[model samples]
Target: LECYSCVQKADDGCSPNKMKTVKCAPGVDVCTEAVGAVETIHGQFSLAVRGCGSGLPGKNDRGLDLHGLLAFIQLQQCAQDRCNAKLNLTSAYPPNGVECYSCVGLSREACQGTSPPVVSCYNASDHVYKGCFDGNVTLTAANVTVSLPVRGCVQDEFCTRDGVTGPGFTLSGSCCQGSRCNSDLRNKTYF
Candidate 1:
């Protein structure tokens, strides 16, 4: 059996691929091609994942949900051996179809007691926004832990994958809608 095999790392998305023979493990009867996209101030960037999968719903799987940054997914699923071959899906920048609260780089101090001046993507002449997201990232060391809050307007294709940036970085909170909805949140410490 064969599958689209691409190995690359992404900070906010997936990378493209290579193909080959494969020995999929048990329960991995499903072969799939997953293409994910994200839009940033710089522009829209994308990543691809094509290989053996157990079963990944376009909606949510494992713990990956809208509560996470990931908001869109395009997938091809099949039980056919070597079923996933060739690529024709040219994922373009998703259109901004939703409006969200825009607060960026807010520290706990900024939102806890004082109301940080909220911003709007609508102010931009070229910004086509479609989703609202409230994101919190936590940093930790031996003992001290600090939280960072993120609020902004995102494209419908904003965040579509469950992710953590790197060491001590994790997606703590997220939302997709509501007026001025990106609110700061308390960090979760299981300590």
Candidate 2:
């Protein structure tokens, strides 16, 4: 009784090569040229085969998933370049650890107030905030659009003097508009 239809013993009466030739019909066309056959009693046995044959230790194994490999490669690229600059994704003015006193005449008292301060990226060589309004506000290139949580007193109320009121706290005073104000607040420190 043949337990396995494809299995044959070494000393079987029928030649192993002949059995293989019998399995392959004469009219059947296969790429025999591309796949050189091994010498056998039945004539020649085509060695070219596809698909996973066996989980043998020395056999060629399927590689890792391509998608996973691609994602890992992308992560490595980002680590090398794109993610190097520190960015504050949240809307906190002057970002928690940013020090603007050196560039702008920003006092600790001014920075301490809950009202988020506007951060502008400045050009030291140009002696101007890159995009600041010409009239009073000093603008910088580092200025990014972000919405901050409202935590401080309203500007109109804070700037009120006696019964008369002046233009509410403006971005111009600290960097360019006020007396002793330096338009380019990028390097000078004010202790």
Q: Which one wins on lDDT?
A: 1
| Candidate 1 lDDT score at position 14 | 22
Candidate-wise lDDT, in order: 0.43, 0.18
lDDT of 1 by residue, 86-119 (tens): 4433333443434444434434456432265544
True lDDT of residue 24, candidate 1: 67
Error of 1 at 143 (Å): 32
In the range 4-106, model 2's lDDT, one tens digit per residue, is 0111111221222332221222332221101111111111111111111111112111111110110000000011111211211111122222122121222
> What is the model-wide C-alpha lDDT for candidate 2?
0.18
Model 1 — which ten-residue stretch has the worst lDDT?
59-68
Q: Give candidate 1's whole-model lDDT.
A: 0.43
Best candidate (score: TM-score): 1
Cα lDDT, model 1, residue 17: 35
TM-score of 2: 0.12
